[PDB]
Short mmCIF file of N, CA and C and ligand atoms in Angstrom, two decimals:
data_model
loop_
_atom_site.label_atom_id
_atom_site.label_comp_id
_atom_site.label_asym_id
_atom_site.label_seq_id
_atom_site.Cartn_x
_atom_site.Cartn_y
_atom_site.Cartn_z
N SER A 461 6.74 7.83 -1.49
CA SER A 461 7.14 9.26 -1.31
C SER A 461 6.02 10.20 -1.77
N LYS A 462 5.95 11.40 -1.18
CA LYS A 462 4.83 12.32 -1.41
C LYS A 462 4.66 12.71 -2.89
N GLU A 463 3.47 12.50 -3.43
CA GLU A 463 3.21 12.83 -4.84
C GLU A 463 1.85 13.45 -5.07
N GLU A 464 1.66 13.97 -6.28
CA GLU A 464 0.40 14.53 -6.72
C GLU A 464 0.08 13.95 -8.09
N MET A 465 -1.21 13.74 -8.36
CA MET A 465 -1.62 13.30 -9.69
C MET A 465 -2.91 14.00 -10.10
N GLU A 466 -3.28 13.87 -11.38
CA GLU A 466 -4.51 14.52 -11.88
C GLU A 466 -5.39 13.52 -12.62
N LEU A 467 -6.70 13.57 -12.37
CA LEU A 467 -7.67 12.70 -13.05
C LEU A 467 -8.78 13.55 -13.62
N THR A 468 -9.28 13.17 -14.79
CA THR A 468 -10.54 13.74 -15.25
C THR A 468 -11.61 12.66 -15.27
N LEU A 469 -12.73 13.01 -14.66
CA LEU A 469 -13.86 12.11 -14.54
C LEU A 469 -14.97 12.52 -15.51
N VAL A 470 -15.32 11.61 -16.41
CA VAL A 470 -16.36 11.83 -17.41
C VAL A 470 -17.29 10.61 -17.50
N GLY A 471 -18.26 10.68 -18.41
CA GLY A 471 -19.34 9.70 -18.50
C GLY A 471 -20.68 10.40 -18.53
N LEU A 472 -21.71 9.68 -18.98
CA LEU A 472 -23.05 10.29 -19.08
C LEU A 472 -23.60 10.84 -17.78
N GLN A 473 -24.56 11.77 -17.87
CA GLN A 473 -25.23 12.22 -16.66
C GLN A 473 -25.85 11.03 -15.90
N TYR A 474 -25.88 11.13 -14.57
CA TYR A 474 -26.49 10.13 -13.68
C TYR A 474 -25.66 8.84 -13.48
N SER A 475 -24.47 8.77 -14.08
CA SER A 475 -23.62 7.55 -13.94
C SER A 475 -23.03 7.40 -12.53
N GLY A 476 -22.82 8.54 -11.86
CA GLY A 476 -22.34 8.58 -10.48
C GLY A 476 -21.01 9.29 -10.30
N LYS A 477 -20.61 10.14 -11.24
CA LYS A 477 -19.31 10.84 -11.15
C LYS A 477 -19.18 11.61 -9.82
N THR A 478 -20.15 12.46 -9.52
CA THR A 478 -20.03 13.35 -8.36
C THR A 478 -20.13 12.54 -7.06
N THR A 479 -21.00 11.52 -7.07
CA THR A 479 -21.10 10.61 -5.93
C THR A 479 -19.74 9.95 -5.65
N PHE A 480 -19.10 9.46 -6.70
CA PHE A 480 -17.80 8.80 -6.56
C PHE A 480 -16.78 9.72 -5.88
N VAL A 481 -16.68 10.95 -6.35
CA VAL A 481 -15.80 11.91 -5.69
C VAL A 481 -16.14 12.06 -4.18
N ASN A 482 -17.42 12.24 -3.87
CA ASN A 482 -17.89 12.32 -2.47
C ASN A 482 -17.48 11.11 -1.61
N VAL A 483 -17.68 9.92 -2.15
CA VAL A 483 -17.30 8.67 -1.48
C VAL A 483 -15.78 8.57 -1.26
N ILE A 484 -14.99 8.91 -2.27
CA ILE A 484 -13.53 8.94 -2.18
C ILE A 484 -13.00 10.03 -1.23
N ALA A 485 -13.66 11.18 -1.20
CA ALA A 485 -13.25 12.27 -0.32
C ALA A 485 -13.69 12.00 1.13
N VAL A 486 -23.51 19.89 -12.77
CA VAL A 486 -22.98 21.22 -13.11
C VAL A 486 -21.82 21.01 -14.09
N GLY A 487 -21.37 22.05 -14.78
CA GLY A 487 -20.35 21.88 -15.84
C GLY A 487 -19.01 21.29 -15.41
N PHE A 488 -18.47 21.82 -14.31
CA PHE A 488 -17.20 21.37 -13.76
C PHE A 488 -17.24 21.43 -12.22
N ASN A 489 -16.40 20.62 -11.59
CA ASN A 489 -16.07 20.78 -10.16
C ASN A 489 -14.68 20.18 -9.95
N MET A 490 -13.76 20.95 -9.37
CA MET A 490 -12.43 20.45 -9.03
C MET A 490 -12.29 20.21 -7.54
N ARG A 491 -11.77 19.04 -7.19
CA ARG A 491 -11.55 18.65 -5.81
C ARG A 491 -10.23 17.93 -5.68
N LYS A 492 -9.61 18.09 -4.52
CA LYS A 492 -8.38 17.38 -4.20
C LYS A 492 -8.64 16.37 -3.09
N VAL A 493 -8.21 15.15 -3.32
CA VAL A 493 -8.43 14.09 -2.35
C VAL A 493 -7.08 13.45 -2.10
N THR A 494 -6.73 13.21 -0.84
CA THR A 494 -5.46 12.56 -0.52
C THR A 494 -5.62 11.11 -0.09
N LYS A 495 -4.91 10.21 -0.78
CA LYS A 495 -4.91 8.78 -0.47
C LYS A 495 -3.57 8.06 -0.78
N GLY A 496 -3.10 7.25 0.17
CA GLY A 496 -1.84 6.48 0.01
C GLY A 496 -0.58 7.27 -0.31
N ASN A 497 -0.43 8.43 0.34
CA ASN A 497 0.68 9.38 0.10
C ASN A 497 0.55 10.19 -1.20
N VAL A 498 -0.63 10.14 -1.80
CA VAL A 498 -0.87 10.78 -3.10
C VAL A 498 -2.01 11.77 -2.97
N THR A 499 -1.81 12.99 -3.48
CA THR A 499 -2.89 13.97 -3.59
C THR A 499 -3.44 13.97 -5.01
N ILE A 500 -4.72 13.63 -5.12
CA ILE A 500 -5.37 13.44 -6.43
C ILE A 500 -6.25 14.64 -6.70
N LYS A 501 -5.91 15.40 -7.74
CA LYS A 501 -6.73 16.50 -8.21
C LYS A 501 -7.70 15.96 -9.25
N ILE A 502 -8.99 16.11 -8.97
CA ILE A 502 -10.03 15.49 -9.77
C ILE A 502 -10.91 16.55 -10.43
N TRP A 503 -11.07 16.44 -11.74
CA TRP A 503 -11.99 17.27 -12.49
C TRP A 503 -13.26 16.47 -12.78
N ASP A 504 -14.35 16.83 -12.10
CA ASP A 504 -15.64 16.17 -12.28
C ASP A 504 -16.39 17.00 -13.31
N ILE A 505 -16.57 16.44 -14.49
CA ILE A 505 -17.05 17.25 -15.61
C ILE A 505 -18.43 16.75 -15.97
N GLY A 506 -19.36 17.67 -16.22
CA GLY A 506 -20.71 17.31 -16.68
C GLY A 506 -20.80 16.40 -17.90
N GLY A 507 -21.75 15.47 -17.88
CA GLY A 507 -21.94 14.51 -18.96
C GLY A 507 -23.15 14.78 -19.83
N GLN A 508 -23.92 15.81 -19.50
CA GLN A 508 -25.00 16.26 -20.38
C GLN A 508 -24.43 16.63 -21.74
N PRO A 509 -25.22 16.41 -22.82
CA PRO A 509 -24.78 16.69 -24.17
C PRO A 509 -24.05 18.03 -24.32
N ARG A 510 -24.55 19.08 -23.68
CA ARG A 510 -23.96 20.42 -23.87
C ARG A 510 -22.54 20.57 -23.27
N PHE A 511 -22.16 19.65 -22.39
CA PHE A 511 -20.82 19.68 -21.80
C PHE A 511 -19.79 18.74 -22.46
N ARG A 512 -20.23 17.85 -23.35
CA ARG A 512 -19.32 16.84 -23.91
C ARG A 512 -18.21 17.41 -24.78
N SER A 513 -18.46 18.57 -25.40
CA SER A 513 -17.43 19.21 -26.23
C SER A 513 -16.23 19.68 -25.40
N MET A 514 -16.42 19.83 -24.09
CA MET A 514 -15.30 20.26 -23.26
C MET A 514 -14.53 19.10 -22.62
N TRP A 515 -15.02 17.87 -22.78
CA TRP A 515 -14.32 16.70 -22.21
C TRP A 515 -12.86 16.63 -22.66
N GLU A 516 -12.62 16.81 -23.95
CA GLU A 516 -11.26 16.64 -24.47
C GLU A 516 -10.32 17.56 -23.75
N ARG A 517 -10.67 18.86 -23.68
CA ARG A 517 -9.79 19.89 -23.11
C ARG A 517 -9.44 19.54 -21.67
N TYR A 518 -10.43 19.05 -20.92
CA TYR A 518 -10.22 18.72 -19.51
C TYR A 518 -9.38 17.46 -19.32
N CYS A 519 -9.39 16.59 -20.33
CA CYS A 519 -8.63 15.33 -20.30
C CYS A 519 -7.17 15.50 -20.72
N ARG A 520 -6.87 16.55 -21.48
CA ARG A 520 -5.50 16.70 -21.95
C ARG A 520 -4.53 16.83 -20.79
N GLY A 521 -3.43 16.09 -20.85
CA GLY A 521 -2.40 16.22 -19.82
C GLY A 521 -2.60 15.47 -18.52
N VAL A 522 -3.75 14.80 -18.35
CA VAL A 522 -4.04 14.15 -17.06
C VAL A 522 -3.32 12.81 -16.93
N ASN A 523 -3.10 12.39 -15.69
CA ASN A 523 -2.52 11.08 -15.41
C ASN A 523 -3.42 9.90 -15.78
N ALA A 524 -4.72 10.10 -15.63
CA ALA A 524 -5.72 9.07 -15.98
C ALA A 524 -7.07 9.67 -16.22
N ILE A 525 -7.84 9.02 -17.10
CA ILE A 525 -9.24 9.37 -17.36
C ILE A 525 -10.10 8.30 -16.69
N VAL A 526 -11.06 8.73 -15.90
CA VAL A 526 -12.01 7.81 -15.27
C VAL A 526 -13.34 7.98 -16.01
N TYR A 527 -13.81 6.87 -16.60
CA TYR A 527 -15.02 6.90 -17.40
C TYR A 527 -16.15 6.17 -16.64
N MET A 528 -17.11 6.95 -16.16
CA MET A 528 -18.17 6.43 -15.28
C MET A 528 -19.37 5.97 -16.09
N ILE A 529 -19.87 4.79 -15.73
CA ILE A 529 -21.07 4.21 -16.37
C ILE A 529 -22.09 3.79 -15.33
N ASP A 530 -23.36 4.08 -15.58
CA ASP A 530 -24.45 3.44 -14.83
C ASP A 530 -24.63 2.04 -15.39
N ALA A 531 -24.04 1.05 -14.72
CA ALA A 531 -24.05 -0.32 -15.25
C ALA A 531 -25.46 -0.96 -15.24
N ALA A 532 -26.35 -0.40 -14.43
CA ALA A 532 -27.75 -0.87 -14.37
C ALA A 532 -28.68 -0.23 -15.41
N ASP A 533 -28.22 0.83 -16.08
CA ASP A 533 -29.03 1.54 -17.06
C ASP A 533 -28.67 1.03 -18.44
N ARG A 534 -29.17 -0.15 -18.76
CA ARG A 534 -28.74 -0.82 -19.97
C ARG A 534 -29.09 -0.06 -21.25
N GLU A 535 -30.18 0.71 -21.20
CA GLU A 535 -30.62 1.49 -22.36
C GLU A 535 -29.58 2.54 -22.80
N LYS A 536 -28.79 3.02 -21.84
CA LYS A 536 -27.84 4.10 -22.07
C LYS A 536 -26.45 3.62 -22.49
N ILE A 537 -26.24 2.30 -22.48
CA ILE A 537 -24.92 1.73 -22.77
C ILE A 537 -24.42 2.10 -24.17
N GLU A 538 -25.31 2.01 -25.17
CA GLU A 538 -24.91 2.37 -26.53
C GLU A 538 -24.36 3.79 -26.59
N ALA A 539 -25.05 4.72 -25.94
CA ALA A 539 -24.67 6.13 -25.97
C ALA A 539 -23.37 6.29 -25.22
N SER A 540 -23.27 5.57 -24.11
CA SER A 540 -22.08 5.63 -23.28
C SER A 540 -20.88 5.12 -24.07
N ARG A 541 -21.07 4.00 -24.75
CA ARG A 541 -20.04 3.41 -25.61
C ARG A 541 -19.61 4.43 -26.65
N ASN A 542 -20.58 5.03 -27.33
CA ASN A 542 -20.26 5.99 -28.41
C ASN A 542 -19.44 7.18 -27.92
N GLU A 543 -19.84 7.75 -26.79
CA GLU A 543 -19.12 8.92 -26.26
C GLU A 543 -17.71 8.55 -25.82
N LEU A 544 -17.53 7.34 -25.28
CA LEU A 544 -16.20 6.93 -24.84
C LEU A 544 -15.28 6.77 -26.05
N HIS A 545 -15.75 6.07 -27.07
CA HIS A 545 -14.95 5.87 -28.28
C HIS A 545 -14.69 7.20 -29.01
N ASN A 546 -15.69 8.08 -29.05
CA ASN A 546 -15.49 9.42 -29.65
C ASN A 546 -14.44 10.25 -28.91
N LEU A 547 -14.42 10.16 -27.58
CA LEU A 547 -13.41 10.83 -26.79
C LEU A 547 -12.00 10.28 -27.06
N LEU A 548 -11.87 8.95 -27.07
CA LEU A 548 -10.56 8.34 -27.16
C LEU A 548 -9.99 8.40 -28.57
N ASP A 549 -10.82 8.81 -29.53
CA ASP A 549 -10.40 9.02 -30.91
C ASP A 549 -9.67 10.35 -31.15
N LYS A 550 -9.73 11.27 -30.17
CA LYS A 550 -9.04 12.57 -30.26
C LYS A 550 -7.54 12.41 -30.05
N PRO A 551 -6.74 12.67 -31.10
CA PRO A 551 -5.31 12.40 -31.10
C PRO A 551 -4.56 13.00 -29.91
N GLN A 552 -5.00 14.13 -29.39
CA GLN A 552 -4.28 14.70 -28.25
C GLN A 552 -4.42 13.91 -26.96
N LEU A 553 -5.39 13.00 -26.93
CA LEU A 553 -5.53 12.11 -25.76
C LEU A 553 -4.78 10.77 -25.91
N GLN A 554 -3.95 10.65 -26.97
CA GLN A 554 -3.14 9.42 -27.19
C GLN A 554 -2.43 8.94 -25.92
N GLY A 555 -2.62 7.67 -25.58
CA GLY A 555 -1.81 7.01 -24.55
C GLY A 555 -2.16 7.26 -23.09
N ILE A 556 -3.14 8.13 -22.83
CA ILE A 556 -3.60 8.36 -21.46
C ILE A 556 -4.36 7.11 -20.94
N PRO A 557 -3.96 6.54 -19.78
CA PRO A 557 -4.67 5.36 -19.25
C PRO A 557 -6.11 5.69 -18.92
N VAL A 558 -7.01 4.71 -19.09
CA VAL A 558 -8.43 4.96 -18.85
C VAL A 558 -8.93 3.86 -17.91
N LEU A 559 -9.68 4.28 -16.91
CA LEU A 559 -10.29 3.33 -15.98
C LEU A 559 -11.79 3.42 -16.17
N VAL A 560 -12.39 2.33 -16.62
CA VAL A 560 -13.81 2.36 -16.92
C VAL A 560 -14.51 1.74 -15.70
N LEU A 561 -15.47 2.46 -15.14
CA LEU A 561 -16.13 1.99 -13.93
C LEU A 561 -17.61 1.74 -14.15
N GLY A 562 -18.01 0.48 -13.96
CA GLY A 562 -19.38 0.03 -14.13
C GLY A 562 -20.06 0.20 -12.77
N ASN A 563 -20.55 1.41 -12.53
CA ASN A 563 -21.06 1.80 -11.22
C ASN A 563 -22.48 1.23 -10.99
N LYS A 564 -22.91 1.27 -9.74
CA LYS A 564 -24.28 0.83 -9.33
C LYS A 564 -24.45 -0.68 -9.41
N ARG A 565 -23.35 -1.39 -9.16
CA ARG A 565 -23.33 -2.87 -9.07
C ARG A 565 -24.37 -3.41 -8.05
N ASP A 566 -24.75 -2.56 -7.10
CA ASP A 566 -25.73 -2.94 -6.06
C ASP A 566 -27.15 -3.08 -6.59
N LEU A 567 -27.42 -2.52 -7.77
CA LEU A 567 -28.76 -2.54 -8.34
C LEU A 567 -29.04 -3.82 -9.09
N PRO A 568 -30.33 -4.25 -9.06
CA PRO A 568 -30.74 -5.32 -9.95
C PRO A 568 -30.47 -4.92 -11.39
N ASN A 569 -30.00 -5.90 -12.14
CA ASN A 569 -29.81 -5.80 -13.57
C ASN A 569 -28.50 -5.13 -13.95
N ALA A 570 -27.66 -4.82 -12.96
CA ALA A 570 -26.34 -4.23 -13.25
C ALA A 570 -25.46 -5.17 -14.11
N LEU A 571 -24.87 -4.65 -15.19
CA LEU A 571 -23.93 -5.41 -16.02
C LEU A 571 -22.67 -5.69 -15.23
N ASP A 572 -22.10 -6.88 -15.39
CA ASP A 572 -20.82 -7.19 -14.76
C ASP A 572 -19.62 -6.77 -15.64
N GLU A 573 -18.39 -7.04 -15.19
CA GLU A 573 -17.19 -6.56 -15.90
C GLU A 573 -17.07 -7.12 -17.32
N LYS A 574 -17.29 -8.44 -17.47
CA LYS A 574 -17.34 -9.03 -18.80
C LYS A 574 -18.38 -8.37 -19.73
N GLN A 575 -19.59 -8.16 -19.22
CA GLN A 575 -20.65 -7.59 -20.07
C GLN A 575 -20.30 -6.16 -20.47
N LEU A 576 -19.73 -5.42 -19.53
CA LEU A 576 -19.29 -4.03 -19.81
C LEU A 576 -18.18 -4.00 -20.85
N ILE A 577 -17.19 -4.87 -20.67
CA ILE A 577 -16.09 -4.95 -21.64
C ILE A 577 -16.62 -5.23 -23.04
N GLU A 578 -17.50 -6.22 -23.14
CA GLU A 578 -18.06 -6.58 -24.44
C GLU A 578 -18.98 -5.49 -25.03
N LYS A 579 -19.91 -5.00 -24.23
CA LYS A 579 -20.92 -4.07 -24.75
C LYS A 579 -20.34 -2.69 -25.01
N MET A 580 -19.33 -2.30 -24.24
CA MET A 580 -18.61 -1.03 -24.47
C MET A 580 -17.50 -1.14 -25.52
N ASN A 581 -17.31 -2.36 -26.04
CA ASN A 581 -16.26 -2.66 -27.03
C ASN A 581 -14.89 -2.15 -26.56
N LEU A 582 -14.58 -2.39 -25.28
CA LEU A 582 -13.31 -1.93 -24.72
C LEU A 582 -12.10 -2.58 -25.39
N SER A 583 -12.30 -3.80 -25.91
CA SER A 583 -11.16 -4.56 -26.48
C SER A 583 -10.64 -3.87 -27.72
N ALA A 584 -11.47 -3.04 -28.36
CA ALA A 584 -11.09 -2.31 -29.57
C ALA A 584 -10.10 -1.18 -29.30
N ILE A 585 -10.00 -0.77 -28.04
CA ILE A 585 -9.23 0.40 -27.63
C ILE A 585 -7.77 -0.01 -27.48
N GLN A 586 -6.96 0.45 -28.43
CA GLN A 586 -5.61 -0.09 -28.61
C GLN A 586 -4.47 0.84 -28.23
N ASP A 587 -4.71 2.14 -28.15
CA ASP A 587 -3.55 3.01 -28.03
C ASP A 587 -3.02 3.11 -26.59
N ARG A 588 -3.73 2.49 -25.66
CA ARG A 588 -3.57 2.81 -24.25
C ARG A 588 -3.89 1.66 -23.29
N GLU A 589 -3.44 1.83 -22.06
CA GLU A 589 -3.84 0.97 -20.99
C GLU A 589 -5.29 1.26 -20.63
N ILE A 590 -6.10 0.21 -20.62
CA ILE A 590 -7.51 0.36 -20.23
C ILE A 590 -7.91 -0.72 -19.21
N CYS A 591 -8.62 -0.31 -18.17
CA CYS A 591 -9.02 -1.21 -17.11
C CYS A 591 -10.50 -1.03 -16.87
N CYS A 592 -11.18 -2.08 -16.42
CA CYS A 592 -12.61 -1.98 -16.17
C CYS A 592 -12.95 -2.73 -14.88
N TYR A 593 -13.57 -2.00 -13.94
CA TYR A 593 -14.07 -2.58 -12.69
C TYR A 593 -15.55 -2.35 -12.50
N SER A 594 -16.22 -3.34 -11.90
CA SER A 594 -17.62 -3.21 -11.47
C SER A 594 -17.58 -2.70 -10.03
N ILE A 595 -18.30 -1.63 -9.74
CA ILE A 595 -18.22 -0.98 -8.41
C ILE A 595 -19.60 -0.53 -7.93
N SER A 596 -19.73 -0.28 -6.62
CA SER A 596 -20.91 0.44 -6.08
C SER A 596 -20.42 1.56 -5.19
N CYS A 597 -20.64 2.80 -5.61
CA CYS A 597 -20.41 3.93 -4.68
C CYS A 597 -21.33 3.83 -3.46
N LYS A 598 -22.58 3.39 -3.67
CA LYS A 598 -23.58 3.35 -2.61
C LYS A 598 -23.16 2.41 -1.46
N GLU A 599 -22.67 1.23 -1.82
CA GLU A 599 -22.28 0.22 -0.83
C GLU A 599 -20.76 0.18 -0.61
N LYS A 600 -20.04 1.15 -1.18
CA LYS A 600 -18.58 1.16 -1.13
C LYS A 600 -17.96 -0.17 -1.53
N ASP A 601 -18.49 -0.72 -2.61
CA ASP A 601 -18.03 -2.01 -3.14
C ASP A 601 -17.02 -1.80 -4.27
N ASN A 602 -15.84 -2.41 -4.13
CA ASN A 602 -14.71 -2.32 -5.06
C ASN A 602 -14.13 -0.90 -5.20
N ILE A 603 -14.40 -0.06 -4.21
CA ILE A 603 -13.82 1.30 -4.17
C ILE A 603 -12.31 1.22 -3.89
N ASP A 604 -11.92 0.32 -3.00
CA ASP A 604 -10.50 0.17 -2.65
C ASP A 604 -9.62 -0.19 -3.86
N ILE A 605 -10.04 -1.17 -4.67
CA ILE A 605 -9.24 -1.55 -5.82
C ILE A 605 -9.17 -0.44 -6.87
N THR A 606 -10.25 0.33 -6.98
CA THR A 606 -10.27 1.51 -7.86
C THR A 606 -9.20 2.55 -7.45
N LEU A 607 -9.18 2.90 -6.16
CA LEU A 607 -8.17 3.81 -5.59
C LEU A 607 -6.74 3.30 -5.81
N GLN A 608 -6.52 2.01 -5.57
CA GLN A 608 -5.21 1.37 -5.81
C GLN A 608 -4.74 1.53 -7.28
N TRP A 609 -5.64 1.29 -8.23
CA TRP A 609 -5.30 1.43 -9.64
C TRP A 609 -4.91 2.89 -9.92
N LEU A 610 -5.70 3.82 -9.42
CA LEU A 610 -5.43 5.26 -9.62
C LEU A 610 -4.04 5.66 -9.10
N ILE A 611 -3.81 5.37 -7.83
CA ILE A 611 -2.54 5.62 -7.15
C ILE A 611 -1.34 5.03 -7.92
N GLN A 612 -1.55 3.86 -8.52
CA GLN A 612 -0.49 3.20 -9.29
C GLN A 612 -0.16 3.93 -10.58
N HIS A 613 -1.01 4.89 -10.95
CA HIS A 613 -0.80 5.71 -12.14
C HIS A 613 -0.45 7.14 -11.79
N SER A 614 0.08 7.35 -10.58
CA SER A 614 0.55 8.69 -10.18
C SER A 614 1.84 9.06 -10.91
N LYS A 615 2.47 8.07 -11.54
CA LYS A 615 3.72 8.19 -12.34
C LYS A 615 4.93 8.51 -11.48
N1 GDP B 1050 -28.02 2.53 -6.41
C1 GDP B 1050 -26.94 3.32 -6.64
N2 GDP B 1050 -27.14 4.63 -6.95
C2 GDP B 1050 -26.08 5.44 -7.21
C3 GDP B 1050 -24.71 4.92 -7.10
N3 GDP B 1050 -23.88 5.95 -7.40
C4 GDP B 1050 -24.66 7.03 -7.64
N4 GDP B 1050 -25.97 6.72 -7.53
C5 GDP B 1050 -27.11 7.62 -7.72
O1 GDP B 1050 -27.17 8.03 -9.06
C6 GDP B 1050 -27.67 9.35 -9.18
C7 GDP B 1050 -26.67 10.17 -10.02
O2 GDP B 1050 -25.46 10.28 -9.27
P1 GDP B 1050 -24.46 11.52 -9.54
O3 GDP B 1050 -23.28 11.30 -8.65
O4 GDP B 1050 -25.20 12.82 -9.44
O5 GDP B 1050 -24.19 11.30 -11.09
P2 GDP B 1050 -23.40 12.28 -12.10
O6 GDP B 1050 -24.47 12.95 -12.94
O7 GDP B 1050 -22.62 11.32 -12.97
O8 GDP B 1050 -22.54 13.19 -11.30
C8 GDP B 1050 -27.85 9.85 -7.76
O9 GDP B 1050 -29.23 9.63 -7.40
C9 GDP B 1050 -26.97 8.94 -6.96
O10 GDP B 1050 -27.38 8.84 -5.60
C10 GDP B 1050 -24.58 3.49 -6.74
O11 GDP B 1050 -23.47 2.96 -6.63
N5 GDP B 1050 -25.71 2.77 -6.54
MG1 MG B 1051 -22.37 15.22 -11.08
#
């Protein structure tokens, strides 16, 4: 039956947030995308240091948080891990499901799902449902399963 849901998309700069929205369809960009009888309102929020203080506010009240990672940029994983754990530590975000996406699977040296889970310390995240997929926006790889997970959280 016809529904609407809301997602906030975060993660470091260059991880592929805006690309992902483009494939599925600056400080902020809001877009609505319709899939599987569901209209998804997406907040694509900047990942540069100066925008990270606004992540919490944009995440409050959403159906799901999508956390984008450049899985091939291994140097940035530590920072990515830190920002994700710092975000999920904010009490007002208690219990919101999080989908962690290891983007750029098409590139040499891309971390797989196991490596992302371990290196991002996802297993430590206890208050909520958390999922992690390896994807390529460029080659449209594992985009379908990502959309299915999102739609399943339309509530
Ligand atoms: N090889 C590859 N490049 C990607 C992929 N997704 C995004 N990119 C590239 O990564 C760069 C940053 O993407 P963008 O969507 O601007 O990242 P944002 O800063 O998180 O919004 C751009 O050059 C994209 O073309 C992917 O799946 N594979
Ligand atoms: Mg962007």
